[PDB]
Each structure stands twice: as C-alpha cells, then as structure tokens.
From a paper:
This state had previously not been observed in the γTuRCWT structure as robust symmetry expansion and 3D classification techniques had not yet been developed for cryo-EM when the structure was published.
Microtubule (MT) nucleation is regulated by the γ-tubulin ring complex (γTuRC), conserved from yeast to humans. In budding yeast, homologues of the grip-containing proteins (GCPs) GCP2 and GCP3 (Spc97p and Spc98p) and two copies of γ–tubulin (Tub4p) form a 300 kDa complex (γTuSC). Spc110p, a distant pericentrin homologue, recruits this complex to the nuclear face of the spindle pole body (SPB), while Spc72p recruits it to the cytoplasmic face. In yeast, the CM1 motif is required for seven identical γTuSCs to helically assemble into a γTuRC at the SPB.
Residue numbers in the entry:
A (entry chain C): 163 to 423
B (entry chain D): 1 to 206, 223 to 306, 318 to 412
C (entry chain U): 112 to 142
Amino acid sequence: SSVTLRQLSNPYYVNTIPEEDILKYVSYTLLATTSALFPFDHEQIQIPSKIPNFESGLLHLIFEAGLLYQSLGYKVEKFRMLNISPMKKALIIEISEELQNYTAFVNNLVSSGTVVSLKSLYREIYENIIRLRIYCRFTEHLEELSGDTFLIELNIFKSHGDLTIRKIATNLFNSMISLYYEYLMNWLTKGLLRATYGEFFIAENTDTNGTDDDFIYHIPIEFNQERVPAFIPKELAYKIFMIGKSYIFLEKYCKEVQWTN
Amino acid sequence: MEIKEVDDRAELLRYTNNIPLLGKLVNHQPLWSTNPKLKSFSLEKISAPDQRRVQEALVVKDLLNVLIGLEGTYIRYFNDYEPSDPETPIEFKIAKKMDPSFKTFSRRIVRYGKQYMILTRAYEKWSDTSFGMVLQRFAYEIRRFLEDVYLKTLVERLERDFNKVPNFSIRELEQIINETEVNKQMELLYNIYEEIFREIEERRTNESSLHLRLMVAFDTTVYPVPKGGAILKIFQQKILENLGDRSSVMFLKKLLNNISQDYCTMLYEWLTQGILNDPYQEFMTYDDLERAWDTQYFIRKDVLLRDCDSEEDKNLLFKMLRTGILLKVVRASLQIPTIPSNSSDITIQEINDFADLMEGSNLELYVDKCYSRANEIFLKLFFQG
Amino acid sequence: DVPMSQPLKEQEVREHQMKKERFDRALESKL
C-alpha cells in the first residue's frame, strides 16, 4: 500500500552502498581529497565494487569535477613555483579564483543539506563541471605558450556562441590585458621594458657588437612589428615605441630630468 | 543481489587532441556486457501477480537511469555500443524476461533517453570552433534546456516521486513525460538535430548583377557545416512545419530568437558602422586583405539569409553590401573606429528580433534606412570635405 | 493574327541598350 517504489526496490540493493554513504564521501572527492569510500589517488579514483554500474556511471560524471579540480590545482602549484610573465599569473590567478568559487559552491550545496540524491547533485554541479572543463582545456600547454598567444585565443573565444565561453574568455582576457596595459604604461611613462619574457613587442636590444657598445648612435630598443598585437593599430604601436624611445633619449642623454619626470 | 568484484577507476582522459572543447574529459564506467558487476537477476522469479509490483519498481529505477544515458539493471546498452567512441549508435536491450507491459512502456520511454544522449553529445561536438557561431549558440541553448527543463523535471518531479509516492507507476511516468511537454521539447530539439545532421551528411557527400558590381566574387563554397543563414533557414522551415501548433512555434521561436542574436548583431554593425567581425565565417560577406586598399569582396552564397534567385533579394543583397562598404570607406577616410549617431541624423535601431526582420519586407526598409545613412554621410564628406 | 512588328521605339531602345551593353561587356569581361 504505502510502500514506495524505492522501498520495494531496496531489498535488491542490500549489498550495495546506500545513497547516504555515497553522499557523505562524495563531497570530499569533489574537492579532490580522498576517502575510504572513494580511495582517490594522485590521479585515479578507485571505485569499489559495491557501487553498481548505474551509479558508477553517474559518479564518473559527478566526479569529473574532482578530477578537473585536482588537475587545475596541480598546475597552479606548478606555475606558482616558476618565474613567469605576470600575464600568465593573471591566468593563474583567474584559475585560482574559479577554483575558489567552485569550492564555495560545492560547500554550499553540501552543507545546505539539500543534496539527497546524486541526480540532484549532478544537476546542480553540472554548470561548474563545465566551467572547469573550459579552464582545463584553455590551460593546456599554458607553459608552452606566450601571453600574447593567449590573448589571441581569448579574443577568438570571446565571440563564441556559448555564453559561458564568452564570460570566461572575457574575464581571462580582461585580467591579462590589464597587465598588457601596465606594460604599455611602463614603457610610455618610464621608457621601461621589464619582465616581458618576449611577450611585449618592444624589447631591449642586447645584440651588441663592439661598435657602439656604449650606445652613442644607437639606443638599444627593438621595435618588433611582427610581435605587435591585434588591439594596437600599427600607427600607434609605432608611436608607442617612439614615445618610450624618446623618453629614454631625453632622460638618458639630454638629461632634462625635471621636465621628463 | 550478489556483487561481482570489479575494479573500476575514474580518471581523466590523457589525450584531448580530438575532444570538443566542451566534451567529457573523463573515462566511463565499464559496460554490463564486459563487466557485469552485479549478479544477473532472472526477473521471472518475481513475475507473479503481487510480485510484479516489485518488478515494476526495478524497471522504473532503470528508466530513471536510462533517461540520463546510463544503463539500468534490466535495460542494457546495445551490444555494439561503444562509449569510448562517441560516434557509436545508441540502442538498448530490454531483458526479454520482463513483463511485456513493461517492455512496451520501456521502449516508449527509452526513446527519450536516446534523444537525450544524442543531444547531449551533439552540443558537445558543436562547441568546436569549426562550427558556426549560430550553431554554437544553439548548442548552448540545448544544453540549457537540458539542465533547465529536462533534468529539472527528472530530478525534482520524477525521481522524487519514485522515492516518495506509494502509487507511482510506470503508467504515470509516461503520463508525466507527456503532460509537461518535456518530451515535445525534446522531440523538437531532436528533430532539429536530425535535420542539421542530415544536411551535414549531404554537405559531406556532395551575371545579371554586373551593372552594379565592384570587384566582387560569389563564394559558392559549400561548407560541411550549415553556418549563418543556412541554420537560420532550417529554423524558418521548422516553423512552417509546425504551423498551427502554438506551443511548438513559441518554443522554436524562442530558440531562433536566441541563436540569432549574434548574427543580427554582426549584421547591425556591418550595416550601421561598416564593421564586420566574422571569425567564424557566418556572415553573408567577407573581404580580402584580412597600401592595402585593393579590397576584394566576396559573397558567401552558402550562408545568405535569402537565396537571391529573385530580383528583389538580389537588389537587397547588393544594397546591404553597399551600405557597409560606404561606411567602411568613411571610417577609413576619417580614420575613426566608428561613425557617431550625431552624424547624419538617422537613428538606426538595433535588430531586436531576427525573425521579425526576416518577416515581411522589414529588411527592405531597415536596409534602406541603413543605406541612406551610409549614403548621406558618405556624400557629405565627399562633397564638402 | 496580323503579321505586324512590335513597336519601333521599343525596338530601337533595345538596340541602344544592347549596343551599350555590348560595349560595356567588351570591357566588363576583363575589367
């Protein structure tokens, strides 16, 4: 009579792990920590035999977030330890921001006590899985790529039909480009080329050859037109170059420091 | 039920070189057919009246999993299903020992599960940059549908009732699927998928304007993907197919209204600013030069909004091109990124609704206004400047 | 029916346009 279909099906799942136990250890896995129920290794999540294939399949999907989270966390540390362009850091920072948001999100759902089923869980976390998938793919080979390269790809993604893609591509771009802006300012107001790692089109000319090593005729600044980004019209890229070059000329050789300053 | 010892492992796929940007980046549970994990149950043991209700409970549990693309206890993936190769056909085996009333309901319900898996897979594929922009937005809309409606219903209404309703039955399950019209929406999306798909398979398989021309070529390349106007036309056709069904067309219109926003935005800027930015090649036109003044123009016949086998559409097409070209020249001459609203006193409103623009001779008047603005501004500068 | 020519102005206008186009096309075909 009053018995529900789940109650009727229960006798056949008596040897399996109940939903509560799953839910209790899933959140730990979602944050890429490990547990006795889900012996999560440095890479793989061991899935015990007491989880039926139906549930295993759903958990493969749910746990994707933990796996993606783990991967992103690892590269964040990889980069934290390296001396890299601040624009790469801008991306790293954004990754960390996303991971922090993820964390809050997961903890909210879990601590709310409103997740009573994996299906509900999956549906709620689904968007975050995607967001992580996006970062995970955008950060592939991050270390092999230059800051400009990412800005270019981001510009492409900023027009992508998917709205989450646009939000992420836009935000990542904004974070990085704001430092490009800073590089440009350093050049424009200080004549400064610093920590460019070759990502800035204006470079120190270190290719000396005896004649003029004292920079009497030449001021050691390169204008690499081929490295000028899409967002800087050629005319300005050159003008920018000449502004800083002039700054240097003036400050270094004419010594009109009070004015210059 | 007894448990077989199977060591499953969840892991990230190691290679993503051929994985769509939004596709799954993890492995999958082994199939029943290779690693059963549970001991088989014969069904017949519980087939008697008053045992049958349990069999039903077990069947419903399976359907709930089937509807999200998972196999169940008595419903198994098709033998040649290959989860590691997402081209694989989707089909299911129903335990033959199942009560025939259930076997019947199951086929009716599993069908939605098939659409689910396909649509899910399709939007993931469509995230690739090789796909058109409008299609990418469509893929987005599908994904949202599934989260907003499909699964919302499944999770909050149906699983919940399985767990809590004493008289829930497979009969109700079918009723719900239909009464909420979720299935209808699934079918409509599905049918769109099939139409697109078919069109793609065909794509994979296969002077009257001279007096008004400049250095322009007609690009007849047939793309593997029905980008731009080609997708938009499908939607128009689907509306025609659904005429008389108000719910269906409203649904379809909402989709069109959403997917077309970027296309019409791109169009707007071309027509009011002369600014065309089309990294996904959706637009009806493109030019050369990605000194550099010898601009060649191209007409992308395959993504046009109108086929232009009529005089009116040909005339419209060219006026539209000229509009944008005149504006481009002005921007180039003035070395301005944009032409302000404070120039010729013509206000051109944004396209808010693509379909509304396509409906009636709205393109003709909209474009005439756009054209006129381009023309007046152009003339002012050329004559007086 | 009466074995008669269509109107003359139209015939001449067509000749003028065809001649103009013949000329224009001599050039459009390469230019």
